[PDB]
Structures are given as structure tokens and as C-alpha cells.
Design a protein around this ligand. Structure first.
Ligand SMILES: O=P(O)(O)OC[C@H]1O[C@](O)(COP(=O)(O)O)[C@@H](O)[C@@H]1O
Ligand SMILES: O=P(O)(O)OC[C@H]1O[C@](O)(COP(=O)(O)O)[C@@H](O)[C@@H]1O
Ligand SMILES: O=P(O)(O)OC[C@H]1O[C@](O)(COP(=O)(O)O)[C@@H](O)[C@@H]1O
Ligand SMILES: [K+]
Ligand SMILES: [K+]
Ligand SMILES: [K+]
Ligand SMILES: [Mg+2]
Ligand SMILES: [Mg+2]
Ligand SMILES: [Mg+2]
Lengths: 518, 515, 518
């Protein structure tokens, strides 16, 4: 009568839905990664500590805004808050840092005069668009400037142009070279520097601009753990980002953001080149008809799970929590269905960057992820992941799937794995056990990147190596036991699964033990 | 393209069938146990060595016939043939000895070693005057069941000689029944008699049975096949007689009548395994219903995780000819597909002209059939029907089998003192052979009852360091597998072990390359 | 608690097996066809009448033996027996006649002396096989003649040779021209004119010999319904057979007998070209290792089920009943499992052609089939057959599959179908309903050939055509009900499914009705 174990026993999906209970409380452990965007509301040290206690795993910096120096000062504070807890290495939480590139964004110019100044637009009214730099800080209700110099080559008559994140639409009546005349189809106020999207068009900007180059190089300087590459359209876009990171950034992980039609059409070659995927729903839902977005979301998450690569669901998950302390019912549903669909991580944007309730937002996500994890139908999920996954002779693969079937058989409080690269923990997570995966590593980077995988609770063993390998192994296992008790995941005399290798070095995980908690 | 691995991939049973292929060769290992009835044809030491090499696992002695001195000698020969292979521990094969009780049979009398001949429509009086107990003929017939006249009615049907001859009852009384013959045939001496519609109140454990089970205990048999078990208390009666001294002897109940079928669930619970006794069962219930009973029992046994044995007329034509009929081919293969742990030969090995050919042919067929099982479905069914547990050992067993499928392992190697750890694995029915390494030679002989368990008996003395004693026995298993052709250097096997000595602590699963 | 209805309710195959109950009695209807081979024991009119009441649906004539005059008299008798029941059109049962060809057999010659003579062959003995026609009637223990002139070309030292249904095995020790020297391996006594098999060998005998041609012409003259073509090795073999049947016998059904390695290897092209398949296990279990036959059986059955074509299981199903009035447990089990495998028809050979208990064997097949039909796991079968079925716009297909599902939901007593060609009845049977399919037709050939499909109970309407079509339809629907009532398939108030088209002529079946029985 807990963890939805009654519904876990159903022999159909529908009987499984029918058995779900609001009075079956979940376990302590939460498997889904939380990712928070840091900005004015959340960049203070004091508050960042509170985000970490609340459940933040990764901190994301949007490089569509702000300066290398401002960002460097966010990071510094994230690292200070994080290390504030190394005091007790048993309760320490590694906290990753991710870099979100500008990429091929299209923006409007400044509104003439005051900073905040917006101009009201009205349906049917007229708007001329120019590329004349005279006008770039002189935008208003008749004339508007755009930073995409080649716009006219690619937008025809009939075309639609959305501005301010889908909320203002315009139609292309007449067009020269230099300028476009438009009729306003949906009005509203327009401020300075707003996102422009061109649904019909083949936008021809480079995947990595010189601005992107400098930003990527800065992130290599700063030892960030991952990069969220914007607007990826094809594999070669991914490789180009991989080259700009080069040898020095070779361990930093690349998440292609999919946020347009081409990204979606060529998803297979992009996923093959990337380390993970983000479903970038804001842009994506302007670049395609908003009603189609749920399908791309489910296509991308499914294929990532089929391929054992992390997928993040993003944007407007709890929008209303920017202004209010509780979410709407669609927001509640949406976070929960992201987890149920299969998402490894879930992202907060404005809600933590600039909102009036960043901590509450983090908590709500933590609370909902945990309910929805219990609600997942593991029976079917696990069987469908066994079937699709190929056959191999890799003993770690066999050991990984054995540990998972065993975790179901005995309702183990956790599956513990020792791992240098993380790779042995990733092989377990791909099969989606209910129980949490406590990944014990010495490598601080592996610990931080581990958060991209559903279920991995990384822990960082700071202790020196023993002279006897067998003793060193057992000390790490036992470290995972102490973390699990201290966290409430399990208590003494509960059974856990433990994974280890037949010899030192990566790639040898082959041993699975069913072990009582000491 | 080997082991029907193509068929094993399919999404449906029907596509699985379509992908079955006569040119996909089976692995060398054979998982289904073979039991052979020993008799005039096969009781010599010379013939028994060859039966073992051809794949016999359990020697059955039928106590419906023979004297204790006779069976004691049979055993002595089996133990001799078996021990002749201890020369090389790596190739030694444990052989079990099983005792199969007479039970409450009914038999005819002697004849006036000659045979009279009943014709359809003819008249036959049946009698209980013991003066006639050694002169039966076309007219008069003696049976040794004294209450026969109390339980029969006007019209009831009597089958004689394993169902070949049949009589109907035209008039009753006491001492006499008058019967019309319905199926003619050549009656002989002391033949089986069956009274389908009737409830026979003979003891389950008769005076003779009691002395025969004692023989079992003294002779040190491994298991007992108790005939005509009708209800759970019959099995308790048997367990009692075996008593304290006989308590590690497994009791396999033989279902051969309508009541045993009906009270199957309770008999299963009390028994350590089941034998589907198709000979008698197929006269006591209509022959067309046997396959239903058989599949019901194999099914409930696989569900309970207890061994079940298919028996009787599996290769009947091979008593006289050296190839079986096509039916006989089919039937053996379907018993394995149904889920039988063991298959059995009777007359084929006891008294036929081709005992070794019959054993070989069970070995070949079982090996083909085990590769044609749709494990995808079978494993998911057994895994699901399994109640969740706290036992680390169940978890470890299921983890092992899951891993044996993901990497198509050459075997699952298990150390076990009592057998129990190997049994847990075999309940889930891996494709891969389970090589169970033990020092207890009784554990090794009984382990044949379970599908896929190839017991190996370790004769090495105990190393003083426990980890080294564990490795040695793992390596021994490896050498057995290499030598028998189950696998070779660099293949993967699963290895299952515990974290300390003593029963009940198996908790460790390793995926290991063969050295 | 009848028809194994408790077992039909189970969620898994394994639970389905567990609930099979020997006290859950079957319905009256038997769905699997029974094909009896005719010969001395069964060819009297008196005996044939009773074969028919006992359940023979098809009369099989084995052309490997006997003259045209003798077979003509057999057919005459088949039809006298059959037509003896036409007095009562309600109880009248179409009985088909099938011709089984000789084909490329290899046969020995005559034993010297007595026509009835045998010789002993003893393990270790030398036996010489000659082609010199001198010896064709002087065969004995030292010298054996056979009728395949090219045998020496196709065998080598080491080869095996089986004689008389695999009883006797020889091993070639030397290969001359015009002879072989062999060692007897399995001895046994040998009589005259016995079949020879060469497992190793690329036998080259012609698909359709001069004698097969005489024979097929004769079948066309006698208006047989189906041909069983022996030793089909490839599609062109089937074509060759079709030519000889030509126009006069274009609608005569060709069932390819698979009895050798090449047939099995090329099964798909043979299947496509044929109207049906027989698994001829006698020859097959000598041409391939005996332990592999059950594989071939199940491959062929599954593939014919998948394609919707009749498949017959044949040979030694009840062999002991040639001498004993009750079958062995393996035989009882073999038959059940052929039905459970998915076979449309099961066949009897010596059991009915020369044995002592022809009626009893026919009755046993009836009884076992009826039990085994109930024990089928229809939930899974029907789900998979629907699943595998290619998708079609064909209204008749959609109607068939709706009728089958409807028959399941209301546990109907029959599926009544009107059909000219048989086709619409076949499309129901391919989906494998529990309920018997009663096919009403005015076409006597259609009736006789429907016996090759599991479930079809053909009924032959002799009444003339009503002027008003709608009444002509009702009249045949109503003749089906009378047949069902009289046979005890159902009774007044039971529901049945009735299938019709929207106009006369073949191909228009599109109407399913759920109908209480008056
Ligand atoms: O996940 P990875 O990178 O393969 O790391 C797993 C490795 O960790 C170990 O358990 C311990 O190795 P170290 O002692 O070198 O950390 C190995 O046995 C195993 O092969
Ligand atoms: O299957 P069983 O009878 O419980 O025996 C399994 C036992 O065998 C072992 O692997 C070896 O024990 P021993 O050293 O006592 O033979 C134990 O670790 C384990 O508990
Ligand atoms: O199976 P077939 O040969 O298509 O026969 C089915 C045909 O039988 C009918 O039900 C009626 O046939 P009739 O021409 O005999 O009236 C048609 O509606 C239907 O098209
Ligand atoms: K960005
Ligand atoms: K007995
Ligand atoms: K023939
Ligand atoms: Mg974007
Ligand atoms: Mg018996
Ligand atoms: Mg043939």
C-alpha cells in the first residue's frame, strides 16, 4: 500500500491506471533530475544553498543574455554554495553547471527612447521591417528593425513572422530587398530585443556564430560540465560544436536542443552525434503548430530511452509559478506526464531565473517527480526496454539487466554501483529500475554529469585509495550504505543490490550482490 | 543461425512457430532428465555403462514385479556401472536410483506361461475362489481383489492387461461376475486390471509396500514413485513409513486415476514432485482426455516450481523396432515443450530389443525441443506468477537467469550443498544449462529431477581458505563444461555463489569469461 | 464449466494450461477434418457408410498401389455410401475424394519364390544392391534390386540407405556401376516392393512421371476434389501438376506433400503456388533426422495458418490401432497436439486402409480433436492471427473478422455463411473461431473441398433458386439453422452469427447479423 505497489502489480495498463492511489505515499528517493536556470531571482549564495537543499541538481546559465563576467560570477556563487556542504561528505550533493548557447537567435532592436519602453500593437495595423542600422535603436509602431540581414531572401509573401515568443504575429503583405511591409494579425505590447521566429523559412544562420565560439571557449575555461547547444538542425551542427570544445573540452557533454522542424526531421543523425537531447518547447512550439508539440516531445523522449541517452524536457513547465506560489492544474499534469513519458531531467527557466518563488518551484518539481515515478508502469516499461535493446556479449550489460530484474524481485532500497566514468551507472539507468542508483565515484566530474540520467544519485568519495584494492572497493560500498541510511532511502536489514568489477579500471563491472544493509 | 535463436526473437508464438528451422542445430547440452526402467534387457553392468554414456540419469526399479534379492542386485549393478566412471571426476555422471511401488494394483491369476484367447461376445465368469487362483482360462477368471463384487454394478466395464482386453458386467452377486467380452485378445498371467467408474478401497500403502519402502531406505535409494496416489493423506502415509531414517528421500506421486486428478492441488502440496502416469490414467479416464490432464499437471508443477515427469509409451514401438513412430517423436518433443522436467522409458529399456537406441533418441529429441521453447513468453510468465519475496536467494536466481538470456551464456554455474540454490534457478527455465557443483552425492543424484540441472560432484578435498575452496569448485565446473563441449575459451558463463559457507546464503552473481 | 471456458479466461498461456479440466466436457461440434485412407479393410459400401457416420470427411486413395479399375470401384463405393444419406438432406454430409500420387518413389523388386515371401536381414551381413533387371523378381538376402536406375550416381561410400519405411538401414561400402555393396546396420525381415530412401542424396526422378500423368488424367475423369502431390521439391513441380489437370480440372485443389529436405527449404515458394500442404511425416522422418520432424511440422502449420491455407498433418498418428482397438498414449497425445499446433485436418493411413479397427480409429480422431479444439488458447491465437494479417480494404475481410470477434463476445453456437466458391467461408476459418462455421452452398464441389479448412461444416442446399433473392437468402440461412438444431450444435434461443452479401454472385459478402435461433 505504498510506492503504488498495488498498481505496479496490474497485468494491464488500464488496470494499472485504475489502481493508482492518492493515499499510497511514495518513497523518499527522487529519480528525475531537476535543472534550474539561474538569474536575478536565484544567483545569490544564500538562496543557492536553499535551491540545493530543495533538490537542484544542475544549474543552467542562459548565454542569450548577460556578459562573460556576470556569468563567471554566477558560477563562482554556485560553486561556493555547493562546497558549503562538503563539510559532511555523506550529505554533500554534487551540483553540475550547464551552458545554454545563444545559437542562431533572431532578435528585434531597441525601442526608441526609454529602456522599458514598449509599443502597443493593434490587429490590422501596419508594420514595416527594415535592416537599416539607423533604425536599430529606433524601433516603434510603424518601423521595426531585425538583426537578420538576409531575412528578405527567405521570407515570401503570405509568410508569418512571430515576435515576442509567439505572442505577436505579423503577415507578409509586400516585400522588397532591405524592407518588408506587414499586417499585424495578433497584437500586444512589444519591448526591445524580442525573439523572432520564421515558421515557413529556411533560416540560413551559422550553428556556431563567433559569439557562440567565444561563449563555448569561456565555458571550457570555467570547467562547466555540459553544454546545451541551441537550434541544432543536423549532425554536422553537433560536430562543429564538438570541434570548438576540442581536446581540452573533450569530456564536457553536449546536449543538442531541438527547437525547429529540421531538428525534428533529422533527429536520428543528431541524437547519434550528441550526448543527450533537450526538447526545447518554447521555440519548438512556435516553429511548428503548438498542437503538434506533444508528439515531438513523445517521439524524442521515446527514442532517447530506446538509445540510452538522457533527454531533458524543458520550458513553461510551471510558468504560473513566476507570479504565484502554486502551479496550475495543467502545470501539475505536465511535469508528471514528462516523467511518465520517460524524461531523465526536467527544466525550470523563468520560474527560478526571475520568478518571485524560485524555491517553491524547485520543491514542487521534486514533489511531482516523486509521485510520478511511483506511478510509472515498470512491468511493461522494463519488458519493452529488454526487447528493443539489442543482444550483446558485454558482461556489464548482462550484469546491469540482472541487477535490475533483481531490484524488482526483492524491492531493494537501492542499487549501488562503483564507477569511474559513470558508464556502469548509465547502463543500469537505461533499464529504469524503481529503486535509486547510488553511483559511488572518486571523479568529481563523473558525479556532476551523472544527474542527466534518471535514477542516478551520485556520491563523491573523497577518501584516499587503500593499498588493498579489495578493501578499497568495500570502503566505497560502505560509503554508499552510510549515504543511503542518512538520506532515509533504506535502513539496516533492508536488502540492496551492489555492483562491482572483477579488477580495477573502467569497463569491468560484472558482479552483482544481494546484500543486507549493515 | 543456431539454437532456434531466430525463432526465439519473434514477437508472437505464431511467428515463433513459423521461424522454427530444421537446420538450426541445438547446443550440445541437454536439459530434460531421462529416466529408464531397468529389467532383463538392461540390468547387466555392460549394458548399464552404455545407458549412462547414452544419457540415462535415473534408474527406475519397478516393484510391481521381482523379489528384493533381484532388485538389490540390479542396484548393485547400477552402482557398479556408475562407479566405473569415477576414474575421471571431470566425466563422472551421478546416477539416481528410484523405487516405484506396486501400490493398490489389481491382478489376474495364473493360467491353467501360456495364453488363452478371448473372443468378442464370449462369456467369462469372474471368481474369487482361491482354488481357481492358478487356473484361469477362456471361461473362468480369478482376480486378487476380494471386494470387487461390492464396487462393481450391472453394466460396469473391466479392462484387463493394460486396457487391451475389455469386459462388460452382465450379472452380479458375491464371488461371481458374469461378463461379456467386448475386445478380444490373448490374456496371460497376472495382468493389470482396471475398473474405471469404480472407487477401489484398497490400502494406499499395503503390507508389501511397507516392506518395499524399507528396502528403499536400506538400499539408500534417492526417490520413490508412489503408485495410485489419490489424496494428500496417501502421501503422508508413505512419508511416515519412510520415516525418520528415510526423510531425505524425495517422494514423487504418481497420478493415475480420476481422484488424483481432482485432488491434484493437495497432492502436489504434500509431494516433492509428480509423475504423470499415463498408462493407468488413460484407462481410468477416457484416453482422449489424457493430454488435458498431462498439460494441467505440467503447468501446475511449473507454477509451483516442483518437478514433474512424463511417463509411459513415449517410444513404445521401439520395444520391437530401432526407430520410433512419428507420434512417438512428437509426443516426447511436446512433453518437453509443455514443460516436463523429466521423461521416462519403461518397456523400452526394461525388456525391449533396443534399449540404448531408445535412450539416445530421447536425448536427441529433448535437445531439439529445448531449443524450440519460446522462452520470451515462458520466462515472462513464470517471472510474473512468482510472488515477490524478501529472500535474497530468489532475487539472485532471477537476476542470474535474466542475465543468461541477455548474453546467451554457455551455462549458469551454481554451488549448492542441498540443491536448493540450483532448484531456484531451474524454476525460471533458462535456455542455458545449470551446472550445479556439490560435494553431497545425494544432492547430486536428486538434482536430475529438475529441468536443466546438470549436477557435477566434486571429489576434491576442502581447501582451508574458503574463497579458494569456492574458486576451485567454480573452476571444476568450467572444466566439466569445456570437456563436455557446452562451451569453450572466452565464452561467457554466469556464476552463482554465496558470501559465506553453509546453506542459505547464495547472493552473488558474476558474469565471467571461460578460461 | 464446459468447453474449457474457465481456461479460455486466463491472462497467460501458463495459467491457461493450469485450468484445463478433464471434467469440462466439449460441445458436440468437431472442427478438425478427418481424412481416411481407403483399402481392403474399409472399401465395402457397408463399412464406408459407417466410416461416414463415424466422421470421415475425405476419402484418400493411395495411387502408389492398385490399378485404375480397382480405384474406380473404390470411388464408386465412396459415392454409393455418401449418396445413401441424401434421402435426408438435413443429415447429408458431403464426402470428398482425394487422390494421392505415387511420385518419384524408389522401390525394391520381388522376393524370389513365394509372392508373399520375406527374407531376413541380419546386422553385419553384406547385401548387394543391383540394377541388372535380371534380378528384379529374384531378390533375396544377398542381392536386392530396386527401380531407380541412377542410384549409383547419387550415393557415395559412407551413404545411408533405408528400406521399408526406414525399418532397415544399409550403409554403402563400395559403389560400382550397376551395383552397390552394402553392410546391413539395422536388420529386420524384408518383403517385396518396399520404399527406399536416400537421406544424403540429390535424387533426380521426375516431379511428374508418365505414370503420374495417366494417374492425374484418371482423377480428372473421375471428378475428384483434391490431389495430394507426392515429393514436391519446388514451385515448378506444382505448376507441372496444374498443367496436367488443365481446364477440365482447374478447380481441383492441389495439396503439396512436403516429404524431403528440399521441400522444407523451399517451403515458401511451394506454399505460394499450392492450394494447401500436407506434412508427410513418413518419408520426412527418414529423409531428415526423426527428432527434427516436430520442428518441420510446426513450421509448416504455422506458416499455412499465417497465409490462410489448408495444412494436413499425416502418417502414424494412430498406428498401433492397426492391431489394437486402443491407441497408445503417444498417439493420443500426437493427435491432440496436431490440432493444438493449428492443423486443419488430420489423416489416417494403414489404420483405416488395412487394419482391424478402422471404425475405432476414425472415432478416436473425432473424440481427441473435439477435446483438443476446446483446449486451444483462442485469446492469443486470434490476437496474433489478426495482428499478422496484412491490412486490406476488402470488405469481406473486415466482415469475417468482425464475425469472428462477435462469435467470441456472445459465445455463439455457429457462424453461418452462404458461399458459392467457398471463399467467404475460408476467410472466416483463417481467424480460427471456437464456433463451428456452417457453410451453405448449392455447389457440390465447393462443399466437398471445404473439409480442408478447420471449422467449416459444409452443408449442401439442393433447393432451387427463389425468384425473390431476399427469400432465397433466408431460405439458406434457415436450412443452416435446421442443420444445426438436428446435429445438436445449438437449439432454440441460442445466438448465431449469420453472414451474407448485398447482392447475388461471388465476392460481395459484407453483412454480419447476430441472430437468435428459432
Ligand atoms: O563505470 P566504469 O567506468 O566502467 O567503472 C567501473 C569500474 O569500477 C570498479 O568497480 C572499481 O575500479 P577502481 O577501484 O579502479 O575504481 C571496477 O571493478 C569497474 O570495472
Ligand atoms: O544451495 P544451498 O544448499 O543453500 O547452498 C548454497 C551455499 O553454497 C555456498 O556457495 C558454498 O558453501 P560451502 O563452502 O559450505 O560448500 C554458500 O556460500 C551458499 O550459501
Ligand atoms: O464466398 P463467395 O463465393 O464470395 O460467396 C458469397 C456470396 O454469396 C451471397 O451471399 C449470395 O449468393 P447467391 O448468388 O448464391 O445468392 C452473396 O451475397 C455473396 O457475395
Ligand atoms: K539560449
Ligand atoms: K509399479
Ligand atoms: K503416394
Ligand atoms: Mg532557444
Ligand atoms: Mg501404473
Ligand atoms: Mg510418402
Amino acid at each position: 500500500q505504498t510506492q503504488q505497489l498495488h498498481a505496479a502489480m496490474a497485468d494491464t495498463f488500464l488496470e494499472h491506471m485504475c489502481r493508482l492511489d492518492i493515499d499510497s505515499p511514495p518513497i523518499t528517493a527522487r529519480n528525475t533530475g531537476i535543472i534550474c536556470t539561474i538569474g536575478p531571482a536565484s544567483r545569490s549564495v544564500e538562496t543557492l544553498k536553499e535551491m540545493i537543499k530543495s533538490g537542484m541538481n544542475v544549474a543552467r546559465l542562459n548565454f542569450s543574455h548577460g556578459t562573460h563576467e556576470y556569468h563567471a560570477e554566477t558560477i563562482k556563487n554556485v560553486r561556493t554554495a555547493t562546497e558549503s556542504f562538503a563539510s559532511d561528505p555523506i550529505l554533500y550533493r554534487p551540483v553540475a553547471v550547464a551552458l545554454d548557447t545563444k545559437g542562431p537567435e533572431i532578435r528585434t532592436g531597441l525601442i526608441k527612447g526609454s529602456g522599458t519602453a514598449e509599443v502597443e500593437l493593434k490587429k490590422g495595423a501596419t508594420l514595416k521591417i527594415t535592416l537599416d542600422n539607423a533604425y536599430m535603436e529606433k524601433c516603434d509602431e510603424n518601423i521595426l528593425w531585425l538583426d537578420y540581414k538576409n531575412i528578405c531572401k527567405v521570407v515570401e509573401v503570405g509568410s508569418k513572422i512571430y515576435v515576442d515568443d509567439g505572442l505577436i504575429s505579423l503577415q507578409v503583405k509586400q516585400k522588397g530587398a532591405d524592407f518588408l511591409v506587414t499586417e499585424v494579425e495578433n497584437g500586444g505590447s512589444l519591448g526591445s530585443k524580442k525573439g523572432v521566429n520564421l515558421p515557413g523559412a529556411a533560416v540560413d544562420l551559422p550553428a556556431v556564430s563567433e559569439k557562440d565560439i567565444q561563449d563555448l571557449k569561456f565555458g571550457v575555461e570555467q570547467d562547466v560540465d555540459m553544454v546545451f547547444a541551441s537550434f541544432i538542425r543536423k549532425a554536422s551542427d553537433v560536430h562543429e560544436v564538438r570541434k570548438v570544445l576540442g581536446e581540452k573540452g573533450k569530456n564536457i557533454k553536449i546536449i543538442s536542443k531541438i527547437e525547429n522542424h529540421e531538428g525534428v526531421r533529422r533527429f536520428d543523425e543528431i541524437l547519434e552525434a550528441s550526448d543527450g537531447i533537450m526538447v526545447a518547447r518554447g521555440d519548438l512550439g512556435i516553429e511548428i503548430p503548438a498542437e503538434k508539440v506533444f508528439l515531438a516531445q513523445k517521439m524524442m523522449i521515446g527514442r532517447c530511452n530506446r538509445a540510452g541517452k538522457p533527454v531533458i524536457c524543458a520550458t513553461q513547465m510551471l510558468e504560473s509559478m513566476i507570479k504565484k506560489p502554486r502551479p496550475t492544474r495543467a502545470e501539475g499534469s505536465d511535469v508528471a506526464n514528462a516523467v511518465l513519458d520517460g524524461a531523465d531531467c526536467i527544466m525550470l527557466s523563468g520560474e527560478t531565473a526571475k520568478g518571485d518563488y524560485p524555491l517553491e518551484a524547485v520543491r514542487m518539481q521534486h514533489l511531482i517527480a516523486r509521485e510520478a515515478e511511483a506511478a510509472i508502469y515498470h512491468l511493461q516499461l522494463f519488458e519493452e526496454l529488454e526487447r528493443l535493446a539489442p543482444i550483446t556479449s558485454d558482461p556489464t550489460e548482462a550484469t546491469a539487466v540482472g541487477a535490475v530484474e533483481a531490484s524488482f524481485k526483492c524491492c531493494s532500497g537501492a542499487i549501488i554501483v562503483l564507477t569511474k566514468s559513470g558508464r556502469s551507472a548509465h547502463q543500469v539507468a537505461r533499464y529504469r529500475p524503481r529503486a535509486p542508483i547510488i553511483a559511488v565515484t572518486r571523479n568529481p566530474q563523473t558525479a556532476r554529469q551523472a544527474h542527466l540520467y534518471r535514477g542516478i544519485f551520485p556520491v563523491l568519495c573523497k577518501d584516499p585509495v587503500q593499498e588493498a584494492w579489495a578493501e578499497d572497493v568495500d570502503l566505497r560500498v560502505n560509503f554508499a550504505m552510510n549515504v543511503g541510511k542518512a538520506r532515509g532511502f533504506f535502513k539496516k536489514g533492508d536488502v540492496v543490490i551492489v555492483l562491482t568489477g572483477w579488477r580495477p579500471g573502467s569497463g569491468f563491472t560484472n558482479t552483482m550482490r544481494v546484500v543486507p544493509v549493515p
